[PDB]
């Protein structure tokens, strides 16, 4: 399948930026991570990126945590975040969707074999936090045996022989991080990604998404300005369901609002 | 690209996220060069001599083999300034960071002897550290707490999974992926991404190769095995380094059996776990069957760390050195009878080492062989456990 | 008749019942036997060096001299095994009761840390081993008491008078008065009757003979002075004897000011108590002025025999030696001190001494002067102490 | 004064043994020690031995450190054993009063102050217990200056040195140990002592006191049978004192049966 190349050729049609929230599969319950997917869909979200509840998410701020931390207090499994996904592509054929993941529960029953369930159930591409592009190998190649784009992370402090390797082995997205760190709304990056964005393209690189600290639609505007293809925005979101735990409703309303906002943003 | 292989066999690797890699690539490239900076040497030599008390004692213990053919040592780490070998590898890259030219300190720690090691470098040598340590082991630990505050290291707890040492592992990681351009992490065993198993071998090999020269000059001749206990494998690979070559000398590693490997309560993944991909490196791992990283049990607190260095399970999967497990009742007996047959309180860590060497002694009494025992703390500590278990 | 000389000017003796007066003729002619004995010399530099770790480093404390004249060593006595200097001597006495053919030892203490000492000698060398300790002493130092028993040590808790160090010092001597053919009275310090003060400064000498070694090696002349706390006098005539014969060198040492001279709740007899006769000798005392005897008070538990050794009052006398104090809060300050700029826990005992070279440095910041404190201990044993005050 | 010498000649010329009873000055207190010391002399003691409370009395086993302990209850002082002393000699003129004591209350202020106020109220000897005969010589000449008796102890282990010592230096009485160890009633001695008591009487040493673990009649006739010329007892007396506190009366007349008893046996 070749849905991010749909994707982007459609925004570029229309000069739009692709605007792509991240949830923790299965926070704060199965029933209501998938109503949570249905309304950021419904709300304008281009694509989706997902993560898998893991005991030790060491790229990921205290928002994400804590998402983590619901998903196991629900009792959460991969197997279960598998259904999900089926579930997830079942209901919508062309939205892309690419995993975020930690390296063990790629690697923990095969790696060729995760790659194939993401296949069997429909996922794009995978990004592996902790595997940075010298360890990639294994990981790229069953992820292009099974038709899965792999991602890679182009830091700020990326030299120009890590941004060749970046634009060779991506696929799908580059995903540009806007700053050092972890996952969390609260800390912005500020620093010009103009020169590491001309330069990837110059590469042929994957079509670039700004990530980390991207919690406002001036954020999501500035990205696409600067010549990036999106922006994803996950902290944020996840905030809104922490901060709407105790009545689900208001929850979808308010993820609702500001997926409308960020998306409008792009446009 | 690096300059030394970041593998051994199949284990170790750099499995950090992509940020952190010009980090890991710094600090290989300051190890590589002072390896062969002899001001370095001598910098790191004088610490160890003037200020941390190297070389340490190798103490024979004829009391305990009586009536048997074992001859054993005990190589005396719980002698070194702090009471455990830590402080060799803290020092060594105390002067990493130095030479780098950074001026702060992160570190993790479980037990806290890993925390107080890195405070106390870091008070001499100028640096300011912080130290990253589970809430339950914060609680749990408050003397630890309070030293590493009184040489005045700042002492963050953290709530996050399940609160112990592999969640203080990732919130040193987690601050380490913002602050590296001025913060070196002083990683606390021989595991972890490369360099970090590298480094910490280096800068413990001096136990290893004290030994050789003493156990030579009272015994002309090399001991039929070293034996050391194996949280993360620092004090073991220091002892076991200078040996490798020396084909006719064993190895032996001994994990924590906890309860009994039978009951899964245990410390023991280089044996009893399964590989996987957590803290920067490919290696054995305590885990769940879906792949959740799960803690490690033991008596002894600093045993804990859920995984093992990859030089080990290379060195395992080649039959170069072999590992075994002693239970937390295996261990209390050593420990006890190291204190009433030799005067000598050890580390209810390094009693598991020590009840290896007793178990090879008592099953076959009637063998001739000369063991040396890496004795890599004293156990002062472990006196209210032992005091509340009896 | 003796055959060295009892007294160092007036003040000491052998005021014993008549009774133990044969024991302490046989123990004064073994020790000088033994000291002409090369087999004894050598068995007891084998036990210091490959049992107790001798020898000690001398540490310089660049960090906490900066912006002075004062150049400052520590005497590592805190590495040596146990934990304090104690342990030099009770190896020597162990050896000298296994020389006269006795198997059995008793020991006072206070603190506990001589109790803990004598414990472990005597595992070791296989003697059996009885201590006497203050009742209200056992209640406030559990752990010490734990260590004794862990070691194989009998603990004997004492009720009489004051229940603390000299009722145990009293005890210790009535059952001697009953035992002396079977038993050796391993007694703490370098007080009580001949030849107690001399064959403890001499099993000590070691701490002053490494220290001009070292000293001479380091900085090519002699220190302008040594400063050792004095509790009973043990550590600090070792770390005095051998710089006695040099004149330039000044010999401090430093008693526990408690609260305040003034307050009358302090530790400090040699200047400020009264010449009495107890536990065997003539000596400076803590006492009422009808002549009770009374306790030492300081926040270090272990400086607290209420006496000193007759060899110290009497460099005290001929303007040797000087003698000063150093109050809790003082002492305290050091502790902290200490642990942030240098990454070393002393002992609160130590603490006395480190707190008086302090001063010797910030009242005249510009003199040039080249000191060594004894460090005579660790005080991981006063972390909760230290805590609980602040 | 010489009432050592005139006792022992009054009980040569009756073929009497001294019973000789040992009590601590002010045990249980001032009042009640006055009339324990009247009955003593009443019931038939021959000389008295009168220890003053100290602090660390190390010669002395359980039953006499209760006793200090119950006289520093009651706040007795040294300057009140000496009030307590002139009193009972203003009492009893002729009866042989022996301190037993311990070094540094001698010492304190000034050895030959010490021997002066013994002298000024009446006592005839002192035993200090933590001088030996090498230490002696301040203290004896002190006694001598001042006609106190300075006595010695003979303990078992005594070698012919030491014999000729003791026999040289002391006076009024030589205090012959039955054992090694410390004061105590339970404790008795067994040692065969008509060897020391021979060589004492061969060297023209003062008459031999048997002292320590006497605490029955036959013990009293055993010693004067084998030689001695009497014996002390304090263990056993204070024992009755502190088995009776409750009772002052009774205390009195047990202490009266015992002495009695004990003294008849020296006949
Ligand atoms: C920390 C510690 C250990 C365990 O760590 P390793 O890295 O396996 O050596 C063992 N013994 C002592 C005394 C320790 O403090
Ligand atoms: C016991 C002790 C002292 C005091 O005793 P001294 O005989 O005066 O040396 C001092 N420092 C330490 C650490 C001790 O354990
Ligand atoms: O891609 C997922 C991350 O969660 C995005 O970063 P963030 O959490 O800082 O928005
Ligand atoms: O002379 C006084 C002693 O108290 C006598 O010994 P004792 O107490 O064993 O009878
Ligand atoms: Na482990
Ligand atoms: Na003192």
């Given at each position: 399948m070749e849905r991010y190349e749909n994707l982007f050729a459609q925004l570029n049609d229309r000069r739009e930026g692709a605007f792509v929230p991240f949830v923790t599969l299965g926070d704060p319950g199965i029933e209501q991570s998938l109503k949570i997917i249905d309304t950021l869909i419904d709300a304008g979200a281009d694509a989706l990126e997902l993560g898998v509840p893991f005991s030790?998410?060491?790229?990921?701020?205290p928002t994400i945590q804590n998402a983590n931390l619901r998903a196991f207090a629900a009792g959460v499994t991969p197997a279960q975040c598998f259904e999900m996904l089926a579930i997830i592509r079942e209901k919508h054929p062309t939205i892309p969707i690419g995993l975020l993941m930690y390296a063990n529960l790629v690697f923990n029953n095969g790696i060729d074999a995760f790659y194939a369930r993401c296949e069997q159930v429909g996922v794009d591409s995978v990004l592996?936090?902790?595997?940075?592009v010298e360890e990639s190998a294994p990981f790229r190649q069953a992820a292009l045996r099974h038709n899965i784009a792999p991602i890679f992370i182009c830091p700020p402090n990326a030299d120009d022989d890590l941004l060749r390797q970046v634009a060779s082995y991506g696929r799908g997205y580059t995903y540009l991080?806007?700053?050092?760190?972890?996952?969390?709304?609260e800390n912005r990056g500020a620093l010009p990604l103009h020169h590491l964005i001309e330069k990837l393209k110059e590469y042929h690189a994957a079509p670039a998404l700004q990530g980390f600290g991207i919690s406002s639609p001036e954020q999501v505007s500035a990205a696409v300005r600067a010549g990036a293809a999106g922006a994803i925005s996950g902290s944020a979101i996840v905030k809104i369901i922490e901060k709407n735990l105790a009545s689900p409703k208001q929850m979808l309303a308010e993820l609702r609002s500001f997926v409308s906002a960020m998306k409008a943003a792009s446009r | 690209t690096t300059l030394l292989n970041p593998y051994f066999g199949e284990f170790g690797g750099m499995y950090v996220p992509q940020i952190l890699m010009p980090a890991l690539n710094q600090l290989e490239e300051a190890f590589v060069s002072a390896q062969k900076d002899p001001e370095f040497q001598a910098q790191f030599a004088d610490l160890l001599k003037n200020?941390?008390?190297?070389?340490?004692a190798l103490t024979k213990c004829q009391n305990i083999t009586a009536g048997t053919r074992t001859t054993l040592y005990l190589k005396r780490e719980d002698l070194l300034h702090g009471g455990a070998h830590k402080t060799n590898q803290v020092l060594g890259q105390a002067l990493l960071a130095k030479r780098m030219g950074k001026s702060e300190i992160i570190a993790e720690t479980g037990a806290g002897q890993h925390g107080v090691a890195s405070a106390l470098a870091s008070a001499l040598l100028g640096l300011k550290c912080r130290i990253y340590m589970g809430a339950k082991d914060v609680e749990r630990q408050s003397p630890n707490v309070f030293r590493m505050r009184l040489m005045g290291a700042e002492v963050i707890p953290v709530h996050s999974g399940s609160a112990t040492l592999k969640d203080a592992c990732n919130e040193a990681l987690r601050d380490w992926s913002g602050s590296y351009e001025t913060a070196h992490y002083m990683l606390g065993?021989?595991?972890?991404?490369?360099p970090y198993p590298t480094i910490v071998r280096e800068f413990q090999r001096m136990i290893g190769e004290e030994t050789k020269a003493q156990i030579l000059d009272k015994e002309g001749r090399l001991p039929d095995a070293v034996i050391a206990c194996v949280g993360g494998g620092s004090n073991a690979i220091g002892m076991f380094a200078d040996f490798?070559?020396?084909?006719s000398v064993g190895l032996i590693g001994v994990e924590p059996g906890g309860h009994g490997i039978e009951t899964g309560e245990?410390?023991?993944?280089?044996?009893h776990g399964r590989v996987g991909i957590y803290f920067g490196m490919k290696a054995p791992m305590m885990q769940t069957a879906d792949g959740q990283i799960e803690e490690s049990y033991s008596?002894?607190?600093?045993?804990?760390?859920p995984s093992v260095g990859p030089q080990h399970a290379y060195l395992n999967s080649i039959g170069r050195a072999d590992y075994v497990s002693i239970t937390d009742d295996e261990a209390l007996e050593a420990f006890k009878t190291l204190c009433r047959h030799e005067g000598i309180i050890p580390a209810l860590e390094s009693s598991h080492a020590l009840a290896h060497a007793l178990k090879m002694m008592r099953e076959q009494p009637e063998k001739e062989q000369l063991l040396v025992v890496?004795?890599?703390?004293?156990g002062d500590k472990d006196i209210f456990t032992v005091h509340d278990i009896l």
């Open positions: 030790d998410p060491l790229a990921d701020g592996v936090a902790d595997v940075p991080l806007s700053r050092s760190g972890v996952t969390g709304a | 200020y941390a008390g190297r070389p340490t065993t021989a595991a972890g991404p490369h490798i070559n020396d084909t245990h410390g023991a993944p280089l044996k008596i002894s607190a600093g045993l804990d760390f890496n004795l890599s703390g004293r």
